[PDB]
Amino acid sequence: SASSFLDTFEGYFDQRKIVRTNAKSRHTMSMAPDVTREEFSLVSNFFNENFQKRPRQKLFEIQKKMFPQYWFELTQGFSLLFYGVGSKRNFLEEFAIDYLSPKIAYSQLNSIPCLILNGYNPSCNYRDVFKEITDLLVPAELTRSETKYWGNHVILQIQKMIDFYKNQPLDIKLILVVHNLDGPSIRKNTFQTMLSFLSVIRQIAIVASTDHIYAPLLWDNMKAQNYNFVFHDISNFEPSTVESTFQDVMK
Template identity: 30%
Template sequence: MDLNAFESLAMDEEGDEEEEFGFSRNYFLARELGSSSRKKSGRKLSEIDLVDEQVLRAAVSEIRPKNEAGIEALLRSYKDQYSKWLFVLRCGFGLLMYGFGSKKVLLEDFASTALTDYDVIVINGYLPSINIKPVVVTIAELLQDKQQCRRKVSTGNKQRTQQQFNTLSIDDLLTYLNEEVEDVKDSFVCLVIHNIDGPALRDSESQQYLARMACCSNVRVIASIDHVNAPLLWDKKMVHTQFNWCWYHVPTFAPYKAEGVFFPLILASGTAAQCARTATIVLQSLNPNAQSVFKVLAEYQLANEKAEGMPGNTLYTKCRERFLVSSQVTLNSHLTEFRDHGLLKARKHSDGQDCLYIPLSSEALQKLLSDLG
């Protein structure tokens, strides 16, 4: 190799090294500049111009879900399994449905189609708060009626009334279901639970009560789960002995319309209207008398904004005057319902007596009363 060729080769190698060094230097320089710019960024999430929740939900409701025909066809395909699911229930098992997509329509269609010979009670586990005791009371009443029909008990005999059931604790009610209604054969009550892994049912106490209901010989549970960690709610005894689950993978790919109502939208602003709307949805699930009692409390709070709350005896007097309650026990049952749903709180007045108040702003209360009509 001559000298000129050697020098040319050396220059080419040196150029390649400089080019490679240039690439690496630019890469690390870009990384450094990028990290420094991110550290110095002054942008905040609070500065985003959020949309009103009602406007955003109205826009979301206008979005047509994709592949509606495919979803409907998939739901129809599950109808072939209804007879099998009913057979599994009659054998003493519980049904647990899992898979992507809302299973609310599927479970309700199964209940209205295949469970027409049985009493069905529905629990919407996706609600923000749930009171389990009324469910147990309803089951006890239904099974007691079935006992009367089977034994042909005369109306003169002593039987527990709804008010007597309401005075019992959940533990006593579950004991009654286990011990006193054993003779009701092949006439069980079906408990349909949408989202048994919902926010209001994830605590250990609620799951224990549901498990004890499920292991009653006259109760069958049909439930759905959507959270990936839902099985962690139960231990081995609850799964195999109490709930006695029979698992079914039933993906529907249906949108979570009903389940998503109570979850705040990320791009929506938290306004008084949003708080009022959530409270309205909860109150509309209660009976008219309970709504009227709540209105009395809300009107008093709006008229006495500087007061610490409404004394309990004052509320009772006003409700008696309007013929909304007949006794203190009835009023207390309404107040317990409000507390369970997070619509009522109590605090000590300066003179020592307990005062009741609604944890909402005046603007939200006005909007709530307007929505309730």
């Protein structure tokens, strides 16, 4: 850019200048090479499994030494929100399955069940997620007085769960691994209300990930208070092979 500033509001105002019509290039993808789906996939997995794999493995071995600190934060009622550059899918599965569930199961004497939401899926739906939560936790059904007048039964059920679990012993019964809390269907307000109200309950551990740069805009004071986040930057430059297949790539 023919600019004097790059960073801050100075760079924002200096790089948004009115470029003339004659200065604009007319280049398109018609002068770009054509690639097929299969060679794209082939070069993709070869670069994902060989370009800087050894520094990524060293860095992943570095971040694994923070797992007891994550467990200690989860025992005090904080929800983990992991952010960074690159995919955090394998990190969240490995921490929540290989480490967190056996440590929690041994610390309170089967392992603790881990429910994994995939928010990179657009078809992640809060009613079916609450159906499996009901299956795992077996809460008491709402009475007729509690149903109100065409009220949302999921939210009223969770409020019943909140003032039931306030008296229970503080033993973690469910681990909730939310991949991509900022994904296209999970970022909507009803799903976020559902998950923050589930984050109120001490007996559920919440491990979440975000990918968008504007993700803290999802949470107001009520939602940030209910979520009770401790933030952790675990940037690894992971390629995100799983999440990339839910968008149309070659277009």
